[PDB]
């Protein structure tokens, strides 16, 4: 019933600190005599783990990853957390502080992910992207939809106020080199049905509130 | 020594075994763990000493194996109950160090894909940067080896764009590749091309554009 | 022709500590020297020679005149209690080449005992220039090797016209030969020096010295070390006797890969792996120490003379340490268990109604050769209720681990070469830090 659940919110920059609250919550006693650890995770990668530090606070797992980072513990409220500075990009993660009850990462929490970006918010730009009759009928028509210089993700990606979203295929985004992230989104409809009704892209990228749509039409010259 | 996937691989249906492997020193000959991890949450673990399940975890899963090197089987999986799992260790100071990765798959019928081209639209003009899109849509497995030319030319930058696998509904694949070049190093040349190259088809197809395709 | 009368009949010098004063009780009595700093730290039955790099700690031994020449044409051998404190990675690569001779008979010649880095080492200077050596690479295993803060034995078995041997525990380690030599006019002055080492925090803390006019053979050194360990007290982990209401570990004898680990508030305990160290470099790896959970052993009922030397089989409690609180292990009536006979253990079981059996004894029955200890559990009538083990088991939703338990099922194993109540009682002592 032990409900890990983490906070420490937002985005970091480089050089900066980061704080990381492991608030292990509903278990009164909590800290009684097992260890508590951390999990390092970048998105789509092997996985090592951070640390594992006591309540008594002997020391953490100390490979060639410490003197950056730092463990803390707190038997006010069973807590601890995890302290972070001179940080590069390569650990933008989602990071995971872990009940090590009896030796064994059991029971884990929703988590939250961490952002080492450089840049700050920005409206997203949307783009439209139409076919045509040029190689028409590959099978059918898929037209497709491109959105980019956004930060940071999410991105909203639907079609029509969200109508058919049959046979849409978005992708999972990639960040571009400059400092930005990239993606797009497409549809796939009959060979001959365009130009007879609408297809308009629909990106949104709340944190910086610019609800943009184009009213994208197959362009023939 | 520490961990290796030996071998590092998965190929299954609806129903079968699964069969993993590792491979470790075994100073400490430790019977050890096996982590699964739903996409849509947090990780979580499957076994303890390669027997011992946890509360809450259907018996369907077992392992087995002496020293530290371990493997482990699983027989009739729910694609709702598949993810990537992981092997341990027993480090002296231990949490486990974690085994490289356990490659996973869901078994479609074999089938080629559908490949696409797009050109950029205005804003490259108003950019000045540019960007080719192709889409190839709705195939399988992952293996996709999409590459470019320039006129001609292949390329060695302009090639990080490999957005990669998903899964569907219907269990298949679709994935997208762009470019990124500036406008004098686009318009510079008049026709690129999508080299997609899938082991399924094993017959190369592409597609290609017309700058100015008015 | 007996083991014990020849071992009296050749013993020609004994340092042995008596009421804090070193003499030799060999019949030959010689000199014994002392100086304001040559202290002395606990001993197993009494107190324990000590060494401390520097010109204050000299014990040396002008002999007899009549056995000055003892070592003209004859064998012999050294033997002590023995430890050194755990060499850290620090240190270690630091003087890694350091090669002081603590027992020596330099000045200028003759047999020589050498410790240098993690070796042991005989080293003997004849008059033709002769010279044999008889290194020890180190027992790489540090978590029970050779130097390990481990009090331990060491003889070496010279003889001239045949090899000299070493022998820890008794046991062999290492040999060479010695033959094609001279006669030696060997000083009499009998060194105990750091001599020319480079480390402040040296020491050696010999116990127990003596020497024998004669060879040996492994049959009666194996009694002579049993001779030696008294049954008496009752040693911890490095061998110095227990110490009541002091801070202790616990590990077991045939799970040094594992420790304790408590579980919840007052509910039971349970077993887990091994946090520890490991230089692949210099050839140095040992299971971690002083990390788990802290025991204190105190006497059921505070008496006159209450010293903290534990005697053989003596009733106590036992309390764990946690917070610096305190908190006492046992087991309350009804107790559930594993087939009823392996007792589950607990810790302070705060039982409204129920009464706990919090009467335990420290009792010694197994290991006359290694520094183990047994803990029993009676009930509140005098009933031996087991012996606190290893067996394994689950209980309720937790996974299934490695529990401590009670179970005088043990007592028809005790003659077995392992067995899964035995024990270690580490205190927090100086010479040995996780790296």
Same mark, same amino acid.
């Given at each position: 019933?032990?409900?890990?659940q983490?906070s420490?919110?937002?985005?970091?920059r480089p050089?900066?600190?980061?704080?990381?609250?492991?608030?292990v919550?509903?278990?009164?006693?909590?800290?009684?005599?097992?260890?508590?650890?951390?999990?390092?995770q970048?998105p789509?990668?092997?996985?090592?783990?951070?640390?594992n530090?006591?309540?008594?606070?002997?020391?953490?797992?100390?490979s060639?990853?410490?003197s950056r980072?730092?463990?803390?513990?707190d038997?006010?409220?069973?807590?601890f957390?995890?302290?972070?500075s001179?940080?590069?990009?390569?650990?933008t =993660?989602?990071?995971?502080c872990?009940r090590?009850?009896?030796?064994w990462?059991?029971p884990?929490?929703?988590?939250?992910?961490?952002?080492?970006?450089?840049?700050?918010?920005?409206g997203?730009?949307?783009? +439209?992207?139409?076919?045509?009759?040029?190689?028409?009928?590959?099978?059918? =028509?898929?037209?497709?939809?491109?959105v980019?210089d956004?930060?940071?993700?999410?991105?909203?990606?639907?079609?029509?106020?969200?109508?058919?979203?049959?046979?849409?295929?978005?992708?999972?985004?990639?960040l571009?080199?400059?400092?930005?992230?990239?993606?797009?989104?497409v549809?796939?409809?009959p060979?001959?049905?365009?130009?007879?009704?609408?297809?308009?892209?629909?990106?949104?990228?709340?944190?910086?509130?610019?609800?943009?749509?184009?009213?994208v039409?197959?362009?023939?010259? | 020594?520490?961990?290796t996937?030996?071998?590092?691989?998965?190929?299954?249906?609806?129903?079968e075994?699964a069969?993993?492997?590792? $491979?470790?020193?075994?100073?400490?000959?430790?019977?050890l763990?096996w982590?699964?991890?739903?996409p849509?949450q947090?990780? $979580?673990?499957?076994?303890?000493?390669?027997?011992?399940?946890?509360?809450?975890?259907?018996?369907?899963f077992?392992?087995?194996?002496?020293?530290?090197?371990?493997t482990?089987?699983?027989?009739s999986?729910?694609?709702?109950?598949?993810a990537?799992?992981?092997?341990?260790?027993?480090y002296?100071?231990?949490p486990?160090?974690? &085994?490289?990765?356990?490659?996973?798959?869901?078994?479609?019928?074999?089938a080629?894909?559908?490949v696409?081209?797009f050109?950029?639209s205005?804003?490259?003009?108003?950019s000045?940067t540019?960007?080719?899109?192709?889409?190839?849509?709705?195939?399988?497995?992952?293996?996709?080896?999409?590459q470019?030319?320039?006129?001609?030319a292949?390329?060695?930058?302009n090639?990080?764009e490999?957005?990669?696998?998903?899964?569907?509904?219907?269990?298949?694949?679709?994935?997208?590749?762009?470019?990124?070049?500036?406008?004098?190093?686009?318009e510079?040349?008049?026709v690129?091309?999508c080299?997609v190259?899938?082991?399924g088809?094993?017959?190369?197809?592409?597609?290609?554009?017309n700058?100015?395709?008015? | 022709?007996?083991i014990?009368?020849?071992?009296?009949k050749?013993?020609?010098?004994n340092?042995?500590?008596?009421?804090?004063?070193?003499?030799?009780?060999?019949?030959?009595?010689?000199?014994?020297?002392?100086?304001?700093?040559?202290?002395?730290?606990?001993?197993?039955?009494?107190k324990?020679?000590?060494?401390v790099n520097?010109?204050?700690?000299?014990?040396?031994?002008?002999?007899?005149?009549?056995?000055?020449y003892?070592?003209?044409?004859?064998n012999?051998?050294?033997?002590?209690?023995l430890?050194?404190?755990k060499?850290?990675?620090?240190?270690?690569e630091?003087?890694?080449?350091?090669?002081?001779?603590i027992?020596?008979?330099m000045?200028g010649?003759?047999?020589?005992?050498?410790?240098?880095?993690?070796?042991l080492?005989?080293?003997?200077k004849?008059?033709?220039?002769?010279?044999?050596?008889i290194?020890?690479?180190?027992?790489?295993?540090?978590?029970?090797?050779?130097?390990?803060?481990?009090?331990?034995?060491?003889?070496?078995?010279?003889?001239?016209?045949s090899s000299?041997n070493?022998?820890?525990?008794?046991?062999?380690?290492?040999?060479?030969?010695?033959?094609?030599?001279?006669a030696i006019?060997?000083?009499?002055?009998?060194?105990?020096?750091?001599? $020319?080492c480079?480390?402040?925090?040296?020491?050696?803390?010999?116990?127990?010295? $003596?020497?024998?006019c004669?060879?040996?053979?492994?049959?009666?050194?194996?009694?002579l070390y049993?001779?030696?360990?008294?049954?008496?007290?009752l040693?911890?982990?490095?061998?110095?006797?227990?110490?009541?209401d002091?801070?202790?570990?616990?590990?077991?004898?045939?799970?040094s890969?594992?420790?304790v680990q408590?579980?919840?508030?007052?509910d039971?305990?349970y077993?887990?792996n091994?946090?520890?160290?490991?230089n &692949?470099?210099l050839?140095?790896?040992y299971?971690?120490?002083?990390?788990?959970?802290?025991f204190?052993?105190?006497?059921?009922?505070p008496?006159?003379?209450?010293?903290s030397?534990?005697?053989?089989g003596?009733?106590?409690?036992?309390?764990?340490?946690?917070?610096n609180?305190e908190?006492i292990?046992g087991?309350?009536?009804?107790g559930?268990?594993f087939?009823?006979?392996?007792?589950?253990?607990?810790?302070?079981?705060?039982? +409204?109604?129920? +009464?706990?059996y919090?009467?335990?004894?420290?009792?010694?029955?197994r290991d006359?050769?290694?520094?183990?200890?047994?803990?029993?559990?009676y009930d509140?009538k005098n =009933?031996?209720?087991?012996?606190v &083990?290893?067996?394994? &088991?689950?209980?309720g939703?937790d996974p299934?681990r490695?529990?401590?338990?009670?179970?005088?099922?043990?007592?028809?194993?005790?003659?077995?070469?392992?067995?899964?109540?035995?024990?270690?009682?580490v205190?927090?002592?100086?010479?040995?830090?996780?790296?």
């Amino acid at each position: 019933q032990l409900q890990l659940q983490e906070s420490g919110p937002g985005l970091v920059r480089p050089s900066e600190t980061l704080s990381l609250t492991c608030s292990v919550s509903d278990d009164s006693m909590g800290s009684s005599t097992y260890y508590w650890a951390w999990i390092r995770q970048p998105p789509g990668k092997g996985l090592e783990w951070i640390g594992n530090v006591y309540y008594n606070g002997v020391t953490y797992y100390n490979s060639s990853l410490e003197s950056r980072l730092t463990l803390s513990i707190d038997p006010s409220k069973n807590q601890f957390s995890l302290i972070l500075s001179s940080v590069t990009a390569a650990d933008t =993660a989602v990071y995971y502080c872990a009940r090590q009850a009896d030796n064994w990462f059991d029971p884990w929490g929703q988590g939250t992910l961490v952002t080492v970006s450089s840049a700050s918010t920005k409206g997203p730009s949307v783009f +439209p992207l139409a076919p045509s009759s040029k190689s028409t009928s590959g099978g059918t =028509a898929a037209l497709g939809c491109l959105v980019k210089d956004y930060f940071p993700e999410p991105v909203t990606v639907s079609w029509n106020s969200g109508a058919l979203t049959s046979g849409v295929h978005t992708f999972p985004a990639v960040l571009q080199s400059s400092g930005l992230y990239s993606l797009s989104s497409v549809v796939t409809v009959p060979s001959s049905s365009l130009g007879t009704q609408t297809y308009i892209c629909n990106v949104n990228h709340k944190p910086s509130n610019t609800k943009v749509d184009k009213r994208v039409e197959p362009k023939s010259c | 020594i520490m961990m290796t996937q030996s071998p590092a691989t998965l190929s299954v249906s609806p129903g079968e075994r699964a069969t993993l492997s590792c $491979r470790a020193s075994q100073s400490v000959g430790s019977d050890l763990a096996w982590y699964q991890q739903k996409p849509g949450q947090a990780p $979580r673990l499957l076994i303890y000493g390669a027997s011992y399940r946890a509360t809450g975890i259907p018996a369907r899963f077992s392992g087995g194996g002496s020293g530290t090197e371990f493997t482990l089987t699983i027989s009739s999986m729910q694609s709702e109950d598949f993810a990537v799992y992981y092997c341990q260790q027993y480090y002296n100071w231990p949490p486990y160090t974690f &085994g490289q990765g356990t490659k996973v798959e869901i078994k479609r019928t074999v089938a080629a894909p559908s490949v696409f081209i797009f050109p950029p639209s205005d804003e490259q003009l108003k950019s000045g940067t540019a960007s080719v899109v192709c889409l190839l849509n709705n195939f399988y497995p992952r293996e996709a080896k999409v590459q470019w030319k320039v006129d001609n030319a292949l390329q060695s930058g302009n090639s990080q764009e490999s957005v990669t696998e998903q899964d569907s509904k219907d269990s298949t694949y679709s994935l997208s590749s762009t470019l990124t070049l500036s406008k004098a190093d686009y318009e510079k040349h008049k026709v690129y091309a999508c080299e997609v190259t899938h082991q399924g088809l094993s017959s190369p197809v592409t597609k290609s554009f017309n700058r100015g395709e008015c | 022709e007996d083991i014990d009368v020849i071992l009296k009949k050749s013993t020609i010098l004994n340092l042995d500590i008596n009421n804090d004063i070193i003499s030799d009780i060999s019949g030959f009595n010689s000199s014994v020297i002392t100086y304001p700093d040559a202290q002395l730290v606990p001993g197993i039955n009494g107190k324990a020679i000590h060494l401390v790099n520097n010109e204050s700690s000299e014990v040396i031994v002008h002999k007899a005149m009549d056995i000055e020449y003892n070592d003209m044409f004859n064998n012999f051998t050294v033997s002590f209690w023995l430890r050194v404190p755990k060499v850290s990675a620090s240190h270690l690569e630091q003087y890694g080449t350091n090669e002081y001779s603590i027992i020596s008979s330099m000045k200028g010649s003759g047999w020589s005992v050498s410790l240098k880095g993690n070796n042991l080492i005989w080293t003997l200077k004849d008059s033709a220039g002769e010279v044999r050596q008889i290194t020890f690479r180190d027992l790489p295993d540090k978590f029970n090797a050779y130097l390990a803060n481990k009090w331990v034995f060491i003889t070496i078995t010279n003889d001239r016209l045949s090899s000299a041997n070493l022998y820890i525990n008794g046991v062999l380690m290492g040999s060479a030969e010695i033959t094609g030599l001279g006669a030696i006019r060997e000083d009499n002055n009998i060194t105990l020096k750091l001599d $020319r080492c480079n480390n402040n925090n040296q020491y050696v803390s010999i116990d127990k010295f $003596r020497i024998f006019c004669k060879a040996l053979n492994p049959k009666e050194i194996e009694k002579l070390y049993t001779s030696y360990l008294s049954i008496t007290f009752l040693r911890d982990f490095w061998g110095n006797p227990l110490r009541y209401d002091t801070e202790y570990y616990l590990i077991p004898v045939a799970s040094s890969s594992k420790d304790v680990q408590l579980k919840n508030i007052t509910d039971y305990m349970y077993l887990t792996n091994a946090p520890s160290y490991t230089n &692949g470099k210099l050839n140095i790896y040992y299971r971690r120490l002083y990390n788990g959970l802290k025991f204190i052993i105190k006497r059921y009922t505070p008496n006159n003379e209450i010293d903290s030397f534990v005697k053989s089989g003596d009733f106590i409690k036992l309390y764990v340490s946690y917070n610096n609180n305190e908190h006492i292990v046992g087991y309350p009536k009804d107790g559930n268990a594993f087939n009823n006979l392996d007792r589950i253990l607990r810790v302070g079981y705060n039982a +409204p109604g129920i +009464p706990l059996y919090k009467k335990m004894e420290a009792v010694k029955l197994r290991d006359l050769k290694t520094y183990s200890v047994q803990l029993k559990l009676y009930d509140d009538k005098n =009933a031996s209720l087991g012996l606190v &083990g290893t067996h394994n &088991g689950q209980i309720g939703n937790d996974p299934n681990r490695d529990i401590l338990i009670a179970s005088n099922w043990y007592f028809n194993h005790l003659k077995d070469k392992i067995l899964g109540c035995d024990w270690y009682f580490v205190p927090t002592d100086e010479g040995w830090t996780n790296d």
